[PDB]
Amino acid sequence: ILYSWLSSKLSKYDIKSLESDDIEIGLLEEEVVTVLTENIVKCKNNILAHRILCQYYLLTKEYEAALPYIKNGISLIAYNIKDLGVHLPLTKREFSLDLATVYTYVDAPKDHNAALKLYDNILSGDFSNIQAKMGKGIIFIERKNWKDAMTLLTQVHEQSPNNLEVLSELSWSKAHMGYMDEALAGLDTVIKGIKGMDLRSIDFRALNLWRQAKVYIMKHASAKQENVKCAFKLLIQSIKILDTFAPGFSTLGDIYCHYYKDHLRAFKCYFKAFDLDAGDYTAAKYITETYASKPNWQAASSIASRLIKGEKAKAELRSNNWPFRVVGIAHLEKQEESDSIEWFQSALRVDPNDVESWVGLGQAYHACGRIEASIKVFDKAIQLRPSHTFAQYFKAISLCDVGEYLESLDILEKV
């Protein structure tokens, strides 16, 4: 396990230094894995072996398989502290990295602040740890809280100043203020690392090819259209090195209509995103805008399968009532008026001051049978929107269908 890890073939260790057409026969990594299941599981209070077991599976594209032996890792000596009695100053600092990073990146939106007081424990004398930048990075950067997120990005200084990626974070995420060229420079300084051509190694490069591309795209604005046209090389490279990458066309799809105003390949951008997934803000709204304005709402109904169904998509879509009318109005013209109402309820909840959400719902109410409700609804669209013309005709018809010709004489005067 430990000796065999010292003689590994991935991480920064070596067999030769520690001593002091034709198949090979060297000390491979596959000899190690057999000991990590059978032998280690039987013995109790075996902490270093547990730690090393965790660390290999942890950083190598897995935040899941280490989970069983983190809880155990805690159990091992924390229980044994009574009947043996030994110091534990460094126990709360490695398991700060080991425990929290499993929950941070695996569950992408959920358990970010899993440590809570465990990062507060290490961050006292030494101004943090690799974990208080790895785990607390997404706390400061991704969720957006620009108090310490702007300034404190080289709080990785005490442990490791010359690590490749962590020093480049200074201006990557903080690229909306002004430091764009600087960010680009930094990212260039972080590129020189692996540069692989495989599934395991080249993911980092693939994800850089989105990372830097965004920066490149940004640097133009905060006038000239030099690095707007030249951005293609970084975006096109993104969809190339790995295998499949959806955010390439989707991120720069709406960007194509800014300065050049090239809306010809904006059609091809989200047609290309249909290959990957395109479960996002732009693609749906666009796909509706072309097909529904034809008019042709049958193709707009296909967007409902991935518009609200995304689950994580609902968090950033509840400000406006744009995703509810796309799915709702698709059902209206196809003639199934029972399904119409529920969508329009949510839309109403979202947007109180609106015509199409109410008048569209009132059309369904009209067609279903609830004509008494349609009077209430349509007259509220006269109350909300200063004086809507189509609401008076719809209401007039609804007055007629019931039987009352009381205000039908007065309402049809203005129309």
Binding site: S293, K294, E356, V359, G369, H388, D401, G403
Partner: protein, 50 residues
Amino acid sequence: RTSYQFKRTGLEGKISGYKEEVDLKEVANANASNSLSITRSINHNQNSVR
């Protein structure tokens, strides 16, 4: 047998453009024959409930 219907313009089309349709099902809208379809003409001979 025909019916006047008017739809929408396009994206966020608050009543502008339109296209018409035709419908056909069962018979004339009246409770004398049957008309179990809920969309039916309310006559001037009905109380709140009874």
